[PDB]
Amino acid sequence: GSHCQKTSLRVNFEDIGWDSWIIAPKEYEAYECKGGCFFPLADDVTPTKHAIVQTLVHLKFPTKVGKACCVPTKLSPISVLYKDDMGVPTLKYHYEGMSVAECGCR
Amino acid sequence: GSHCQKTSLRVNFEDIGWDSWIIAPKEYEAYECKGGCFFPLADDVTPTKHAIVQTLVHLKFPTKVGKACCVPTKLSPISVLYKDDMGVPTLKYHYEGMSVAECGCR
Ligand SMILES: [Cl-]
Ligand SMILES: [Cl-]
Ligand SMILES: [Cl-]
Ligand SMILES: [Cl-]
Ligand SMILES: [Cl-]
Ligand SMILES: [Cl-]
Ligand SMILES: [Cl-]
Ligand SMILES: [Cl-]
Ligand SMILES: [Cl-]
Ligand SMILES: [Cl-]
Ligand SMILES: [Cl-]
Ligand SMILES: [Cl-]
Ligand SMILES: [Cl-]
Ligand SMILES: [Cl-]
Ligand SMILES: [Cl-]
Ligand SMILES: [Cl-]
Ligand SMILES: [Cl-]
Ligand SMILES: [Cl-]
Ligand SMILES: [Cl-]
Ligand SMILES: [Cl-]
Ligand code: NA
Ligand code: NA
Ligand code: NA
Ligand code: NA
Ligand code: NA
Ligand code: NA
């Protein structure tokens, strides 16, 4: 059963070019939503009626319409130590939208 | 600029096998979110920080991590005339989550 779930994704801030303004941490766990949104669906997929309808339409017209996507439905914040406009290391205690909390078909 | 926007998708309830319980309408406009989530991004894409971070990581490791997805971020309801458990045509005035209102990279 390769369905929509949260899997591991470690993100190094230097690789994405954010080390120019983020001092710490060097890496953090962002996770990622991976998996198919096809039927039969599952309980924790938590689909919208539109993703269900869209998946059905994709099944009958695969070349015209795409299928639903496994995306983050809830995000959690992290804390980062960034450079202030005057070079002062300032802590952003709740940097929102950085880590995946829940996944779902949308 | 092939970016994340709302495009047309007409859904026939008979094709998706929902005509067994939905009397009317035969078809309705559900729309769909289509388009790339790559950079440079746009204003109405309205990305989360995780979709931005994920797209960056995808750019540097295309085979390990997938990119962000263009998905519905807000849904609108429709009205359907369905069969009651005793065969009575009943109107569901607000059948939620059926039509796309806004799109975005998630
Ligand atoms: Cl299965
Ligand atoms: Cl199902
Ligand atoms: Cl829904
Ligand atoms: Cl939902
Ligand atoms: Cl297919
Ligand atoms: Cl397509
Ligand atoms: Cl979100
Ligand atoms: Cl706290
Ligand atoms: Cl904060
Ligand atoms: Cl923030
Ligand atoms: Cl462009
Ligand atoms: Cl951008
Ligand atoms: Cl965000
Ligand atoms: Cl947002
Ligand atoms: Cl690519
Ligand atoms: Cl992949
Ligand atoms: Cl939604
Ligand atoms: Cl009304
Ligand atoms: Cl209602
Ligand atoms: Cl409803
Ligand atoms: Na087709
Ligand atoms: Na997907
Ligand atoms: Na999200
Ligand atoms: Na790679
Ligand atoms: Na997409
Ligand atoms: Na949605």
Q: Please, are residues A17 and A41 in contact by the beta-carbon 8 Å criterion?
A: no
Tell me the technique behind this structure. Answer: X-ray
Residues whose CB falls within 8 Å of the CB of residue B16, separated by 6 or more in sequence, listed in order:
A53, A56, A57, A60
Query: What letter represents residue A16's amino acid?
Result: I
Long-range CB contact pairs, A80-84, < 8 A, 24+: A80/A22, A80/A24, A80/A25, A81/A22, A81/A23, A81/A24, A81/A25, A82/A21, A82/A22, A82/A23, A83/A21, A83/A22, A83/A23
Phi–psi pair at A5, nearest 5 degrees: -140, 170
- Residue A47 to residues A11, A44, A53, B44, B97: CA-CA distances in angstroms? 27, 8, 10, 24, 10
| Distance of alpha carbon A56 from alpha carbon A68, whole angstroms | 9
- Residues B35/B53, Cβ–Cβ less than 8 Å: no
Subunit contact A100:B50, Cβ cutoff 8 A: yes
Question: Is A56's CB within 8 Å of B9's CB?
Answer: no
Q: Tell me the CA–centroid distance for residue B75 and ligand 9, in Å.
A: 30
Domain spans, chain A: 5-105
- Which of A13, A19, A54 best tests the B interface by mutation, with the highest count of B CBs <10 A? A54
Resolution, given in Å to one decimal, reads 2.6
Q: Cβ separation of A71 and B72 shorter than 8 Å?
A: no
Q: What tokens does A16 get?
A: 């994405």
- CA gap B71, B4 in Å, rounded: 8
Q: How far, in Å, CA of A12 to CA of A29, rounded?
A: 9
Q: What does residue A25 show for φ and ψ, rounded to 5 degrees?
A: -80, 165
**For A5-105, CATH number?**
2.10.90.10
